[PDB]
Amino acid sequence: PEESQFFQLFYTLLLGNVSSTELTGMALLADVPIMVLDPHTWNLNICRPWVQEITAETEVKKILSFSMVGIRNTIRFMHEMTAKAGLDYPRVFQIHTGCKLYTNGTRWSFVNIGEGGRDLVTYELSRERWVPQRSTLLAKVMSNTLTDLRAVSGFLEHIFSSSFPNYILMLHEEGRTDLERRVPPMAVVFARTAGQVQLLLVCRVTSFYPRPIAVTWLRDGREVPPSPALSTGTVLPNADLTYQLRSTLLVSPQDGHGYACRVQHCSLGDRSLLVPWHH
């Protein structure tokens, strides 16, 4: 759908001591890594053979590295706010940015900064303002310095209105080999011991791409509604950009119901994957 036109940036600035920064950062379109920051060199590694000779042209790679809001300035801005807040090292800062394009015209864009793994300040595009997320000095100082920097506010506007939208569009056109790949799930059902004289039925679903999926249990062919008896796990990644999930249902032994796991996934179309529990 439109997960494919969702561009995100994740940056971690671990400020060890005064002379030490360790960086990580990633750019994603959907769940496909497009660029990864190399911690040793601070250059943007390109992750896909279809990504390289495209931008390039929009110089997103220049924006992220050398510009007013680029990593080189950001690192120094973060060292400075730690300093101007009287705070001590180590400090970990994080930056989460996104741009989504809906196929009705509208865009969702955001910039979030955290410190120590909690929100710190957010950027309000419409209000041309950075907003504090916590109620202390570091939050007040960073939010005020950023909002006062009217050129930064202007620069971010252009970024989210022009630069990132054009980039998504070009990447979308070039990257279908990853963005439109479909690999159907396979599933297995088995039973294991559980407490209170119950059985745990497990449906393990593997190998699937893209990520969204729905796994339900059927009791005599009708959907089991959610209760404490039913747990669907979190989706887990494989190294090959496929996913795995486990769903479980507590049942009483010899209850006289037949059970099956049903898996709905867009790669399957109108047909579900249906997997009976057999004793």
Partner: protein
């Protein structure tokens, strides 16, 4: 805030003795980001282990996938060993073949 890692150990495909597979250790929900993860075979560190690029979720907490090609056997035990500032000692999670 500090957050201790969730550690989930699983294979790529449902396991069958003698057929190659991938062993995965997914560590997630941790803060700060420094972490050490080893995959073990019969108690000893496996040498050729890859991992994904560190990133983080909406709640700011970090996640990493470590993985290795392996061939399960009846006699061999596999596990994931994690160290993190929130742990007093490394946490070992054995691979449950159901996973």
């Amino acid at each position: 805030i500090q957050r201790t890692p969730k550690i989930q150990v699983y294979s790529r495909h449902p396991a069958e003795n003698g057929k190659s597979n991938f062993l995965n250790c997914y560590v997630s929900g941790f803060h700060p980001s420094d972490i050490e993860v080893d995959l073990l075979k019969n108690g000893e560190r496996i040498e050729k282990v890859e991992h994904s690029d560190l990133s983080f979720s909406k709640d700011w907490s970090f996640y990493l996938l470590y993985y290795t090609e392996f061939t399960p056997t009846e006699k061999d035990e596999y596990a994931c060993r994690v160290n993190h500032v929130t742990l007093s000692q490394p946490k070992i999670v054995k691979w449950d073949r159901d996973m």
